[PDB]
Amino acid sequence: EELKKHEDSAIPRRLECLKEDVQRQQEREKELQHRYADLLLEKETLKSK
Amino acid sequence: SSKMLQHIDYRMRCILQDGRIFIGTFKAFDKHMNLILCDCDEFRKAEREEKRVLGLVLLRGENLVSMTVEGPPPKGAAGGPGIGRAAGRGIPAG
Amino acid sequence: MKLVRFLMKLSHETVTIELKNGTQVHGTITGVDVSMNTHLKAVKMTLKNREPVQLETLSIRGNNIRYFILPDSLPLDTLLV
Amino acid sequence: MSEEKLQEKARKWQQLQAKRYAEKRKFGFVDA
Amino acid sequence: IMLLSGHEGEVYCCKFHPNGSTLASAGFDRLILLWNVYGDCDNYATLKGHSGAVMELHYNTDGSMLFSASTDKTVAVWDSETGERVKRLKGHTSFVNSCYPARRGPQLVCTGSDDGTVKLWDIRKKAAIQTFQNTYQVLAVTFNDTSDQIISGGIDNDIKVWDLRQNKLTYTMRGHADSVTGLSLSSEGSYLLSNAMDNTVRVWDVRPFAPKERCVKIFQGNVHNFEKNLLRCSWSPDGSKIAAGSADRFVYVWDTTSRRILYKLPGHAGSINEVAFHPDEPIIISASSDKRLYMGEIQ
Numbered sequence: 001e002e003l004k005k006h007e008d009s010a011i012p013r014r015l016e017c018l019k020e021d022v023q024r025q026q027e028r029e030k031e032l033q034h035r036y037a038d039l040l041l042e043k044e045t046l047k048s049k
Numbered sequence: 050s051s052k053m054l055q056h057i058d059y060r061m062r063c064i065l066q067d068g069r070i071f072i073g074t075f076k077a078f079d080k081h082m083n084l085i086l087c088d089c090d091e092f093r094k095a096e097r098e099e100k101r102v103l104g105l106v107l108l109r110g111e112n113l114v115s116m117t118v119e120g121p122p123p124k125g126a127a128g129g130p131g132i133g134r135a136a137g138r139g140i141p142a143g
Numbered sequence: 144m145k146l147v148r149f150l151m152k153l154s155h156e157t158v159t160i161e162l163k164n165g166t167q168v169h170g171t172i173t174g175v176d177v178s179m180n181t182h183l184k185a186v187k188m189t190l191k192n193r194e195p196v197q198l199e200t201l202s203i204r205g206n207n208i209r210y211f212i213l214p215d216s217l218p219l220d221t222l223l224v
Numbered sequence: 225m226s227e228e229k230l231q232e233k234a235r236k237w238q239q240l241q242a243k244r245y246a247e248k249r250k251f252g253f254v255d256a
Numbered sequence: 257i258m259l260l261s262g263h264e265g266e267v268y269c270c271k272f273h274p275n276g277s278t279l280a281s282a283g284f285d286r287l288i289l290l291w292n293v294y295g296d297c298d299n300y301a302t303l304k305g306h307s308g309a310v311m312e313l314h315y316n317t318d319g320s321m322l323f324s325a326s327t328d329k330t331v332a333v334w335d336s337e338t339g340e341r342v343k344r345l346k347g348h349t350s351f352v353n354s355c356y357p358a359r360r361g362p363q364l365v366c367t368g369s370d371d372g373t374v375k376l377w378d379i380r381k382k383a384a385i386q387t388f389q390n391t392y393q394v395l396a397v398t399f400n401d402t403s404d405q406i407i408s409g410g411i412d413n414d415i416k417v418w419d420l421r422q423n424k425l426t427y428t429m430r431g432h433a434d435s436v437t438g439l440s441l442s443s444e445g446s447y448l449l450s451n452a453m454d455n456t457v458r459v460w461d462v463r464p465f466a467p468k469e470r471c472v473k474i475f476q477g478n479v480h481n482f483e484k485n486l487l488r489c490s491w492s493p494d495g496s497k498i499a500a501g502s503a504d505r506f507v508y509v510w511d512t513t514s515r516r517i518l519y520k521l522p523g524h525a526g527s528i529n530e531v532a533f534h535p536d537e538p539i540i541i542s543a544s545s546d547k548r549l550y551m552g553e554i555q
Contacts (some may be wrong), residue, residue: 033463037402040464048422052174052182053202066164066207082180082204113204114162117186126301126339131262131289133297138257138523138550230412234392237411237435240484241351241370245309245327251265251285 053078060120061086066112069093073106074123081110088123149222151175158183159212160203165191168201179205258297260549263289268529269313269488270543273336276535280322281549282310283529288324288334293534297551305332305341311486312354316363323365325355331367333379345377347384353486354396358403359445366406368394374408376420388418388425395486396438400462401445407462409436409450415460429460431471437480438488442495447472449498451489453480457500459512475510477517478502481527485545488530499531499540507531507542509554519554 061075063086070093073086086108091101159169160181170183181203188196243249265284272279272293279291288303288310308328315322321342322334331345331352350371358364365377374388374397394410405426406418415429415436433454440449441462448462457475461467478500480487487501497518499509507521507528519540526545533540541551 037464044421050176056202068164110204114164114166114207115201115203117198117201125337126303129262129287129289129299129302131260131291131299133258133260133291133551136257136259136550138521138552140522225413230392233411237393238370245351250308 056116056118058122059118060123062117062119063108064114064116065108066114071103071106071108075116079110082113083110084108084113147175147177147179150179152222153213153217156216157214161209161212162203162207163209164207168203170201176205179208181205181208257553258551260291260297260551261547262299263287263547263549265547266526266529266545267543267547267549268309268311268486270530270532270541270549271313271315272532272534272541274315274317274319274535276537278336279541280313280315281543282313282324283543284309286310286326288313288322290336290339293539293551301339303332303334303339303341305334305344306330308351311352312488314356316357317359321357321363323355323357325352325367327351329369331355331365331377343379345382347375347377348373353394356398358399359401360403364399364403366397366399368397368408368410370394374406374418376406386420386423388423390416395436396488398439398441398448400441407439407441407448409439409452411435413452415439415448415450429470432456432458434480435484437486438501440489440491442491443493444495447495449489449491449500451478451487451500453484455479457489457498457510459498473512473515475500475515477510478508479504483527483545485527485529487527490530490532492533493535497533499533499542501528501530501542503527505544507540507550509540521552523550524548 056075058076061073063071071086071089072092073089075086077085086106089103089106091103093099154173157171159167161167167189168183169187171185172183174182184200186198186201188198263283263285267281267283269283270281277293279293280288281291282288286306286309289299290301292298306326306328308326310324310326312325313322320336322336324332329348329352332341333343335342348369348371350369352367352369354368355365363379365379367375370393372390372392374390374394375384376386378385390410392410392412394408397406397408399406404420408416413432413434416425417427419426432452435453436450437453438451446463448460450458450460455478457478458471459473461470461472479502481503483503487503489500491498496512497509498512502508505524508517509519511518524544524546528542528544531542538554539551540554541549543549
């Protein structure tokens with residue numbers, strides 16, 4: 001009974017941190033891909049010359 | 050005409066020939082630039098300053114010098130045949 | 144001839160005017176009438192001695208006016224026709 | 225995939241749509 | 257489950273409004289009917305301006321403007337509040353199969369027609385700014401996410417991507433065996449969904465940095481029959497699910513990750529031309545040639 005309450009404490013904590021880890025990596029992905037998309041576009045300006 | 054007509058029903062500030070000021074809601078004008086101002090104040094100019102009230106003032110055109118604005122004014126497709134209702138789907142055989 | 148018609152062609156240039164009672168306006172102009180009735184927009188005032196004021200639009204009766212002050216940005220020659 | 229067959233496919237498609245949505249086949253049509 | 261009768265003819269297209277609260281439907285009857293999603297699903301419009309079949313409906317991203325491409329050679333722009341036809345773009349010589357408005361501003365629109373032209377527009381001007389001449393009929397167009405590219409699918413099977421800046425064909429994708437009846441771009445802009453008459457639905461990597469083979473996933477299980485209708489495709493808002501119109505009367509939703517069917521829902525009597533997802537709640541509508549719209553909760 002006690003163990004379940006500690007598990008009930010642990011499960012949101014594990015969910016909170018790991019989802020935040022995943023979320024930051026997606027935020028990292030969004031920042032990376034935004035720059036990376038722009039630089040090909042920049043390369044196309046160079047290619048246009 | 051057309052420039053003056055744009056101003057109508059606004060709250061207009063007039064400067065008379067003697068130096069006085071009127072402020073009034075504006076609804077008439079005429080070929081001699083007669084005016085009817087309405088809901089109106091007489092206003093004169095620490096240098097002392099004062100504010101008297103007048104009603105429905107009719108201004109003989111000779112006096113007017115200038116007038117100015119400072120206020121905003123003292124102011125589908127038919128329903129169609131469709132109906133929604135609750136329904137089941139019903140799978141066919143096979 | 145008929146210089147008041149020259150004062151309608153002049154539209155949407157810029158002017159100072161001094162009125163008769165020592166008033167000065169500084170304005171860009173749109174609209175004028177047969178009896179010289181002036182209307183200016185983008186209006187900066189200066190009364191007699193009293194300090195400047197700035198106004199959205201100002202309409203000035205005809206017979207209060209004295210001299211305009213045209214800009215040097217007029218080539219005059221066009222007025223002959 | 226031959227360009228020949230594509231041109232025939234275009235011809236088939238053009239004729240099909242033109243008659244399907246022909247003005248004399250509109251919903252509101254009443255015959256003479 | 258809700259049933260929405262009252263179209264006198266085939267329903268080709270249906271779209272939820274971006275706020276989810278209202279719904280648009282249109283088709284062979286030429287009328288555009290606007291429905292409330294909640295409550296008794298009542299109707300409160302007839303849009304009347306067209307003279308031919310309405311082929312596709314799209315909202316702008318704020319929802320004030322409804323775009324309808326029609327077989328009458330015109331694209332109508334409607335104000336959603338008043339129902340006034342705001343403008344009539346009348347530049348096309350043949351049937352307008354599709355349209356799609358830009359994600360980002362300004363209010364650009366692009367169009368695909370059976371005349372083989374792909375025409376870009378601007379709502380401010382009455383004429384087309386640019387026209388790309390395709391050799392064969394164009395059945396569906398969409399922008400990319402950045403609003404700089406037109407992607408077009410036509411009866412020439414290949415997918416063609418134009419660039420508005422260079423005015424030139426920029427890359428092409430090969431793999432479909434038949435006419436590309438429907439194109440749809442994910443809300444994130446990375447991926448495109450395609451429907452073709454070769455009985456395959458596919459997902460393509462539209463991103464600049466894709467591998468040389470851009471076909472990432474292949475889905476099966478829809479049918480194109482002898483009516484050869486323009487069966488459309490749509491994405492779920494989260495990108496987890498895809499839907500495709502099918503002519504075998506079943507409503508298909510696939511899971512994009514597991515590549516399985518998740519729902520295969522009977523009850524329509526005719527070919528299902530378009531299926532759309534609600535933006536926030538898990539409600540799905542499917543438009544069919546049986547003159548009915550079916551709306552229902554999924555889990």
